Design a protein around this ligand. Structure first.
Ligand SMILES: Nc1ncnc2c1ncn2[C@@H]1O[C@H](COP(=O)(O)OP(=O)(O)O)[C@@H](O)[C@H]1O
Ligand code: NA
Ligand code: NA
Lengths: 20, 337
């Protein structure tokens, strides 16, 4: 499932801004 | 009449935009209690104001880090704009000041925590719950945009839940007063509009794209475009192919197709009727826009609150000394702060 795939991914915690 | 409200709102904003508040407190007027949250180069602390006894959230920025990251103009933007705005779902800047080492923005403490943590914990929000939040963002964007402001950092991490269960938008780090187009690659990867990624130039419609991402994420429990690295995320966004959860209403899916629209001539918020195409969408049919403005709608969820400087709605963070050099750093750079 997409949920399961999300949960197992590296970006489920707080996400930092980018600024280039 | 929105027209009249917004017209007077612009007058109020412009006065402050033109002559900004400065140096309205100092470090030793506060006792620093603990870190509430962090960003790529900032730290926010719960603090207690000695003479009032009130609690506040103190955003601390190290001038040298601002400079090293080339965020000078962004940071000046942030404070200039934040001090000038006034809206029920925007966090209040209470004081600002600087010292040899750091810049400080002292906000009202929004004790309900990030939308992010509730969202992740609960898993996802019902469509009525998501809609309740979404409506607030719609109005906020209507307000900001009318002042020529672009927000550019919509995400659950930057949205706080207050003691009434209403939203307070924080982090104006990427807010900018611009007439027409701009080019900075900034934001948060999952939330970036395709036009930002493609180095095209872009306008306020990126905010409406982000609203799409937000609604999806609130409703789904995960974002429309995710991957392990930002570059994989960018590919997905640019394709623009979107899939929806089984449980998404037809109405919801239609709204989102129009928000997550890669074609600017087609994106809701960016059409001839502007925000009205969003406000009048079937998905918002049950929304009493005035009641929302007036905070008269019953919130779907009200965070548990235990006393004035309770932080139980926030994660714990590693603390560090707040150092102040005896030598002034980047004085010229931050003159207007
Ligand atoms: N007014 C405030 N009340 C309570 N917590 C806050 C407040 N503002 C910010 N925070 C917390 O601190 C974190 C970072 O604030 P933010 O303005 O986003 O700094 P940054 O630019 O480094 O991301 C937020 O995600 C939230 O956890
Ligand atoms: Na942030
Ligand atoms: Na920021």
């Amino acid at each position: 499932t997409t949920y399961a795939d999300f949960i197992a991914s590296g970006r489920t915690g707080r996400r930092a801004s980018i600024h280039d | 009449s929105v027209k009249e409200f917004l017209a007077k709102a612009k007058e109020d904003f412009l006065k402050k935009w033109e002559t900004p508040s400065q140096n309205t407190a100092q470090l030793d007027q506060f006792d620093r209690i603990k870190t509430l949250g962090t960003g790529s180069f900032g730290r926010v602390m719960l603090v207690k104001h000695k003479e009032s006894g009130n609690h506040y959230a103190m955003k601390i920025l190290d001038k040298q880090k601002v400079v090293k990251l080339k965020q000078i103009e962004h940071t000046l933007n942030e404070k200039r704009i934040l001090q000038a705005v006034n809206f029920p779902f925007l966090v209040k800047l209470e004081f600002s000041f600087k010292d040899n080492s750091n810049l400080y923005m002292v906000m009202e403490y929004v004790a309900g925590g990030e939308m992010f943590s509730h969202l992740r914990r609960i898993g996802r929000f019902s469509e009525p719950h998501a809609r309740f939040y979404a409506a607030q963002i719609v109005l906020t964007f209507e307000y900001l945009h009318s002042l020529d402001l672009i927000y550019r950092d919509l995400k659950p991490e930057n949205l706080l839940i207050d003691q009434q269960g209403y939203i307070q938008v924080t982090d104006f780090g990427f807010a900018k007063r611009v007439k027409g187009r701009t080019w900075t690659l900034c934001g948060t990867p999952e939330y970036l509009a395709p036009e930002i990624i493609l180095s095209k130039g872009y306008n306020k419609a990126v905010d409406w794209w982000a609203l799409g991402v937000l609604i999806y994420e609130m409703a789904a429990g995960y974002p429309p475009f995710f991957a392990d690295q930002p570059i994989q995320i960018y590919e997905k966004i640019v394709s623009g192919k979107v899939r929806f959860p089984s449980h998404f209403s037809s109405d919801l899916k239609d709204l989102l197709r129009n928000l997550l629209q890669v074609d600017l001539t087609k994106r809701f918020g960016n059409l001839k009727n502007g925000v009205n195409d969003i406000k009048n969408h079937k998905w918002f049919a049950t929304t009493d826009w005035i009641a929302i403005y007036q905070r008269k709608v019953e919130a779907p969820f009200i965070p548990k609150f235990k006393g004035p400087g309770d932080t139980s709605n926030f994660d714990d963070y590693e603390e560090e000394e707040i150092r102040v050099s005896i030598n002034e750093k980047c004085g010229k750079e931050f003159t207007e702060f």
